[PDB]
Design a protein around this nucleic acid. Structure first.
Ligand SMILES: [Cl-]
Ligand SMILES: [Cl-]
Ligand SMILES: [Mg+2]
Ligand SMILES: [Mg+2]
Ligand SMILES: [Mg+2]
Ligand SMILES: [Mg+2]
Ligand SMILES: [Mg+2]
Ligand SMILES: [Mg+2]
Length: 326
DNA sequence: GTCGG
DNA sequence: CTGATGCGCCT
DNA sequence: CCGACAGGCGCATCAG
């Protein structure tokens, strides 16, 4: 990676600020800088050169000079050796343990996977599953496996009702060679912004995926969002595939393009795009794009017939899913 | 931590 | 019980 | 120099 040291440095700082400082805006600032530097097509030679980039300011440029000069960052060296910091940071890696729970656990002497296992009874349901599959959830998923997973989900949804449409989004739709999880966007004609004409639309898919042993655990489930765990079937005498995270979002059919835009990401692309919408006087969520009135409140949903219409409203040249990465 | 007005 | 708030998750 | 920073689902907790 061209400026890999720098963007690694920045990501670690973002994680510190998020996990340890609980400073969500410093976290976003560091990630924004990381992103802008990652896409910069020259080897950064100094902090002043990085300072020209939007999102990089005085403090980051200084750290960059230190990093370029010395190969390291004293502030991060101090963070790496601080037991409390590393422990809070480590615990947030379990799905369902965020910054607050991690600090509580560490304050109560819980600092290791070992400790979490002994105190399973202190963990909520999500956290217990996140602990169960700790090692598996940190493995990435080759695209080849994403393809078989896609094949399972789409065939099984089609067996529940031919009128469902399932689309795999996240990094998969962006053309990534590996993914962290599987993101499935689901629509059905009976569920639009005007009417839900059949209940259980999501539940029935989740249940069908449970019946064939594809979905193995449930982290959370409501009427429009499912978060859980799935697993590819393996063959005779083969090692099992790791268990994988799967998120299924049921979106109103008439709001598919806002939904697919949201679910295709990247997360940073969405934050940039939504922030650009605000500068142009709009707000975008997974459902709609709406104008912002003087007061600052959102008016009625604009018409949308493609992902591109959304870009057009905010005066951006279309970006294909593959170009929304990093 | 950064930045637009 | 309702309604509010905040966590941790997702892109 | 100082607010604004993206937006929201499901869950857990809390006041009443
Ligand atoms: Cl360092
Ligand atoms: Cl909306
Ligand atoms: Mg700059
Ligand atoms: Mg976590
Ligand atoms: Mg994903
Ligand atoms: Mg996901
Ligand atoms: Mg992600
Ligand atoms: Mg929050």
């Amino acid at each position: 990676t061209l400026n890999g040291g720098i963007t690694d440095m920045l990501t670690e700082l973002a994680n510190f600020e998020k996990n340890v400082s609980q400073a969500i805006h410093k976290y976003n600032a560091y990630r924004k800088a990381a992103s802008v530097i990652a896409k910069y097509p020259h080897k950064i030679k100094s902090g002043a050169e990085a300072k020209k980039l939007p999102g990089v300011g005085t403090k980051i440029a200084e750290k960059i000079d230190e990093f370029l000069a010395t190969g390291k960052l004293r502030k991060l060296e101090k963070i790496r050796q601080d037991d409390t910091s590393s422990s809070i940071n480590f615990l947030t890696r379990v799905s369902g343990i965020g910054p607050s729970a991690a600090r509580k656990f560490v304050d109560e002497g819980i600092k290791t996977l070992e400790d979490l296992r002994k105190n399973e009874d202190k963990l909520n349901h999500h956290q217990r599953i996140g602990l169960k599959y700790f090692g598996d959830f940190e493995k990435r998923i080759p695209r080849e496996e994403m393809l078989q997973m896609q094949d399972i989900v789409l065939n099984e949804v089609k067996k529940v009702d031919s009128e469902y449409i399932a689309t795999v989004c996240g990094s998969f739709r962006r053309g990534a060679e590996s993914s962290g999880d599987m993101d499935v966007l689901l629509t059905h004609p009976s569920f639009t912004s005007e009417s839900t004409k059949q209940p259980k639309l999501l539940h029935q898919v989740v249940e069908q995926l449970q019946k064939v042993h594809f979905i193995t655990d449930t982290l959370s489930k409501g009427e429009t969002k499912f978060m859980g765990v799935c697993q590819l079937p393996s063959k005779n005498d083969e090692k099992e595939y790791p268990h994988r995270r799967i998120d299924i979002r049921l979106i109103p059919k008439d709001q598919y393009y806002c939904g697919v835009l949201y679910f295709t990401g990247s997360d940073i692309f969405n934050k940039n795009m939504r922030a650009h919408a605000l500068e142009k006087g709009f707000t975008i969520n997974e459902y709609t794009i709406r104008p912002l009135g003087v007061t600052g409140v959102a008016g009625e949903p604009l018409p949308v017939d493609s992902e591109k219409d959304i870009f057009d409203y905010i005066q951006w040249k279309y970006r294909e899913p593959k170009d929304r990465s990093e």
